[PDB]
Each structure stands twice: as C-alpha cells, then as structure tokens.
C-alpha cells in the first residue's frame, strides 16, 4: 500500500452490459497504453513508449478469461448486480486562462461505477466535436474508475462551455459549466 | 437503468528504494469487491472475500499455476521496471510558472510538470510568507503532466516585489517569477 | 524490448 512507484501491468476490465472490455497498463497513475480489442492493436499514450512492443493477444486472451470468471461469479453470487455510484465532475483548464493563448479544458469524471459513461462538450447551444479527446477508464484503489475528457479551445470573452456527463447513477445528465472569467 | 455485472483483474507491482523492494499483488475483483488475490510476499493465493474462497482453493491446488504466479514478480514486475528506468522514470517536464492577480490575492500557477514532486514557496521582499498562503491539492491532468495552484493572501504597498519560488527535479536551480504593481 | 503482463487464470464455469 506504500511504495515509491505503483504500476498496474494489466488493468483488466470486463462487464456484462455491452458486453465490453478494456485492457490498459498504468504507471504512477497514468495510462501507459491501451489495447483496441476490436482493432487488435496496441495504442501507446506516451510518445517515448512507442519503441516497445506488446502482443494484443495477451489482452484478448486475458479478457476471455475474465468473461469466464465473470460468469462464474454471477452464478456463485446469485446474480448480485453492480451498484450505481454518483460520479463527481469537475472542469478546469490545463494552463492559466489568457484570452489570446490556446488552452485545454479538462473535464474530470471521478467515482465512476459501473464503467459506463457519456462525456460530451456543449458550447453556446450546440455540441462540440472538433478537438475533443478522452482517456481510457483509469483504475482507482477502491476499484471504481475515473475518466478525463479534453477539449482544445481558444478562450473568448463570450464563449462559455459545459461538460455533459451521462451515467446511471445520475437521475439527469450532469452539466459542469466553465466560464473564461 | 440497465443491469450490469463487472469483473476486474489488476496485476499490480509495488516498487520501493529502486529494485531493493519489489512486490506483486494480483487482485481479482467482482463489482467493487476484491475477492481473491495473489500476494508475492505470502507466495500463494489468498481469498479476500467469501466469494473468492472456491477460486483460491482451486488455484492453490495446482502446482503449475502456483509456479507461474511466483515467477510473475520476476517475469513481469522486474522486467518492466528496467523498461521504466529508461522511459517514464527519465521523463522530466519543466514546470511553467505564471502569476495572475486576483488587489488582495495572488495566484502562482505551476502548470505542466512531471514527475509529481514539487515545492512552491512565496516571497515578499526576500521574506518568505507562510501565514497567508493557501494551495490547491496536487492536480493530475491525465496527460502525464501535473499542475498546482498556490494562492496568496497579500496586502500590497508601493514598492512591493512578490516572488514565487518553485523547486522541481527537472530543475538544476529553482525557478523564480516576480510581480510588481 | 517487449512489455510483460500478468495473466489471470480461469475458475468455475
């Protein structure tokens, strides 16, 4: 529980909903890479790490074992389902706000469980598509997840933004406002 | 509200004092409950919860399965740590300092740095101010950079020079940024 | 250089 560095050499996720799965490696709380289980390729999140190799079949076979163990635990627990947690959403800028300078809006969606969420950006009455990216579901000690969405923007005095979050723990979609101030 | 059954597997390595201390804890989680784990310090599977008892019974009875798990500390943790020594542990991103008036409040923004270790001090006329400073927690941006904001409760006068003092392992010498009215 | 990963094992049915 106490160390200089903690690494997850295999964050394996499988859930009955989709059914969907996720495979990632984490080091000191950051996503090293994920495996696109559909495309069967390793996608590295840090440029320096592209020099390495990881066989996606390790992820594909890992998820297949989880699918097996999940059906076992569903049966053993008399179909005990997951509890919907109320996610926590906070929006902030990557760097200080200057009306001229480019920036990045960060939408942190914390305490996600189950790992099924919709994160969309709204500006002045329409959804924003250009320049938004997402991290994978990042693991937490309490076995919930958090997820971060980015929106590259050019701050303007009249342009305000909203982070729209859809989760089963929410009775209505949660909007977190961000104003250039 | 759809029903969902979730399964997680985390192969976690804990590093301390370089390679002096290495520990592997593989956690099998159903929903948000760790049910059975293999901790290399004990050297065999241990049920964490009532549901993980049949799994630990079965795995501990297979010497072959027990062989690979005991070697996973060397095969996985130690092997990858040598890769981390040349990559993530070499990553050094210089923090970007910026002072922005909020006058009676002063905010020193330390943005986009890695690794996480940071030290921020305020300075008013070569005299360090500690009675009027308030700092946000360490913020993880999710893109392998961190940021931290240190606010300053101040009372300006004609001739005051406010200086923010930042120390970071990427720096050979601390960074200093000044502000005058 | 190749990255190594821990492997879970099946159980039950």
């Amino acid at each position: 529980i106490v160390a200089d560095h903690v690494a997850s050499y295999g964050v394996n996720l499988y859930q009955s909903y989709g059914p969907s799965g996720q495979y990632t490696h984490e080091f000191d709380g950051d996503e090293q890479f994920y495996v696109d289980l559909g495309r069967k390729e390793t996608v590295w999140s840090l440029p320096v790490l592209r020099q390495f190799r990881f066989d996606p079949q390790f992820a594909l076979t890992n998820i297949a074992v989880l699918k097996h163990n999940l059906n076992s635990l569903i049966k053993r627990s008399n179909s005990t389902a997951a509890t919907n947690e109320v996610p926590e959403v906070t929006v902030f800028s990557k760097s200080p706000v200057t009306l001229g300078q480019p920036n990045i809006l960060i939408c942190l969606v914390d305490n996600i469980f189950p790992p099924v969420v919709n994160i969309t950006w709204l500006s002045n009455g329409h959804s924003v598509t250009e320049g938004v990216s997402e991290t994978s579901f990042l693991s937490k000690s309490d076995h919930s997840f958090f997820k971060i969405s980015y929106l590259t923007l050019l701050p303007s005095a009249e342009e305000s933004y909203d982070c729209k979050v859809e989760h089963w723990g929410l009775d209505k979609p949660l909007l977190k406002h961000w104003e250039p101030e | 509200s759809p029903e969902d059954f979730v399964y997680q597997f985390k192969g976690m390595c804990y590093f301390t004092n370089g390679t002096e201390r290495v520990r592997l804890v593989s956690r099998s989680i159903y929903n948000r409950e760790e049910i059975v784990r293999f901790d290399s310090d004990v050297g065999e599977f241990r049920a964490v919860t009532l549901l993980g008892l049949p799994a630990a019974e079965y795995w501990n009875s297979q010497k072959d399965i027990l062989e690979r798990k005991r070697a996973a500390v060397d095969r996985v943790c130690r092997h990858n740590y040598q890769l981390e020594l040349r990559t993530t542990l070499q990553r050094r991103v210089e923090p970007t300092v910026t002072i922005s008036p909020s006058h009676n409040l002063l905010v020193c923004s330390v943005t986009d740095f890695y690794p996480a270790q940071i030290k921020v001090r305020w300075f008013r006329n070569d005299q360090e101010e500690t009675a009027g400073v308030v700092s946000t927690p360490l913020i993880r941006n999710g893109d392998w950079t961190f940021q931290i904001l240190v606010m300053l409760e101040m009372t300006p006068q004609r001739g005051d020079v406010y200086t923010c003092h930042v120390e970071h392992p990427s720096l050979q010498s601390p960074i200093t940024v000044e502000w005058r009215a | 250089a190749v990255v190594q990963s821990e492997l879970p094992y099946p159980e039950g049915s």
Partner: T-cell receptor
Amino acid sequence: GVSQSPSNKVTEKGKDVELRCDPISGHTALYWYRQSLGQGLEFLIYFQGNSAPDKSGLPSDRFSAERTGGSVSTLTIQRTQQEDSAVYLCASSFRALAADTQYFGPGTRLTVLE
Amino acid sequence: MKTTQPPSMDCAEGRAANLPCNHSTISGNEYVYWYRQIHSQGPQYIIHGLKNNETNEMASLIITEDRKSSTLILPHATLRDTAVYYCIAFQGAQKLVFGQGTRLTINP
C-alpha cells in the same frame, strides 16, 4: 486425458472431414496441430474460451475450427486435398499464452486419396 | 532459445537412463519441458522445470545452476520407455515446437 475422434479417417479427395477433440476438464485453452512423419509439429490454431484470437496458421481457407461451447472443439477440412494427409493432434492447457503444460490426445490419422 | 539433443541413444533395461539436453541461450522465462512420443502415437508429457530439480512418478529432471543444460532421468528403464524424447524451451506463446529429439532405444 484429451480425447479425439475418429482415430482413423480414410477419405476420397473433395470430401469434407470433421475432427473432434475433447479437452481436459477445466482447460480453457485448446490447441490444434498436425504432424507428418518424417515431419515435425505444425501449429494450426488455438482457442481461449470459445474464441480463437489466432486465425492464421491454418494451411488454407478450407480449414476452419470451432469451439462454440467453450469445451469440445471441432476442426473441419472442406474439399480435402492430397497434401491434407497427416496426424492431427489436439492439446489443452489451463490457459493460453501462459506457458502452461499442454496435454495431447491420441490424434486422428487422416489419409486423403486421389 | 533452441535445444540440442543426441540424435539416438541406447540403454540397458533395468538401468537408469540419462538423457542430456543443451540449452545455453535459454532465458529466465523459458521452462525446460520434456515430451516423449512412442511410434507412432500422441506426444506424452513427461516432466518440466524452471530452476529447481523435479521428480515425477515417471522420471526426474536435473537442471544445472546456470540453466544452460538439463538432464532427464528415467529411473528404471523398461521396453515401454523406447520412444523419441523431445526437450523444449517453452515460454509464453501459442506454439510448442519439437526438435529432432533423442531416439531412445532400450535394449533387452
């Protein structure tokens, strides 16, 4: 032990043949090989659970394998050729890609004739 | 890492049969596996090991301290031990590969 059927199969070319394999109970990884003599072990395909992540290794598109139940697997050779004649071996282990001990079956000696 | 074995060997029945295997380039994650195949059936798993010495009800396996060579020991050879014996360096991979093995003959 791993079971395989049939033990022998003599067929005319162009016919479809179906091989059966019964893995050890509790083994979620299942492997297909074929062996000529003199020749070595030729890998064909493997299954983790009911899915085969490695479809390559099959000699041609006339070869197809299934393990729908997650237990018993079947290998089908449509429109057999002369070169298909071999001893088709089946194996199973706890898990794939884990260096688990692979246990073999008696095999199916297939002979295809013009 | 590949393995090399003597192509053919002889042993008298009732005596311990020692089969050698060389694997100098073996890595830390590669196990030393032994199979035998009687003419001409399915391969039979004999024994395997990493660093220690293992003992089956079928045979024993002695691995040198540097892991660069190994020995399979059939305790009390009979006619049923006449087969081809394969020594393999095995790590995480789908394919298990057989070399030429040792054509072991047990003479009466």
